[PDB]
Amino acid sequence: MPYNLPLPGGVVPRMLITILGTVKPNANRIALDFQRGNDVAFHFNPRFNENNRRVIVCNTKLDNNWGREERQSVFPFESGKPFKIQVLVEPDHFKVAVNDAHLLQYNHRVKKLNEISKLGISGDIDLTSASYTMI
Ligand SMILES: CC(=O)N[C@H]1[C@@H](O[C@H](C)[C@H](N)C(=O)O)O[C@H](CO)[C@H](O)[C@@H]1O[C@@H]1O[C@H](CO)[C@H](O)[C@H](O)[C@H]1O
């Protein structure tokens, strides 16, 4: 998949990003990439088949190098099924919920949240909407 949600002003606490769509049939991967220039502040990557195991891989890329992965086995996504991803920005971490249920937390590694200018949305999904607001 290919699509970029511009975040004018960058990421900031109290910001809530909502992603609505439907996972494609025979899906293999999904990915949300919060970017800061060439760096990837927060990579959210559900993998549907890694050695016959489903897993959500989260990481950060700094100076073209991926860091220590943070893996989550709770996997709420289903091929062909609609989904909702919510990312709430906190001063210390990104809080992710899927289908209204808390899923995981990713501590900030990239500290200048204001430089996080956009969110790339890709993978095997049919995007309905990608938006944000404060709460
Ligand atoms: C293709 C692939 O999924 N590679 C993953 C694998 O990389 C090892 C070192 C090797 N290149 C291989 O698999 O043949 O394992 C590493 C973790 O040890 C990683 O999952 C590789 O996938 C990459 O993961 C990062 C996030 O950590 C990004 O999602 C990259 O897009 C992805 O290729």
Numbering used by the authors: 116 to 250
Can you quote the paper on this entry?
Galectins are a family of lectins, which is characterized by the affinity for recognizing β-galactoside-containing oligosaccharides through the evolutionarily conserved carbohydrate recognition domain (CRD). Gal-3 is a 31 kDa chimera-type galectin.
In detail, Gal-3 and Gal-1 bind to TF antigen with dissociation constants (Kd) of 47 µM and 4 mM, respectively, which showed that the affinity to TF antigen for Gal-3 CRD is two orders of magnitude higher than that for Gal-1. In the structure of Gal-3 CRD-TF complex, TF antigen is bound to the concave pocket formed by S4–S6 β-strands with the insertion of β-galactose ring into a wedge like cavity. For the GalNAc moiety of TF antigen, a unique recognition mode is observed, which is consisted of a hydrogen bond network including two water molecules, W1 and W2.
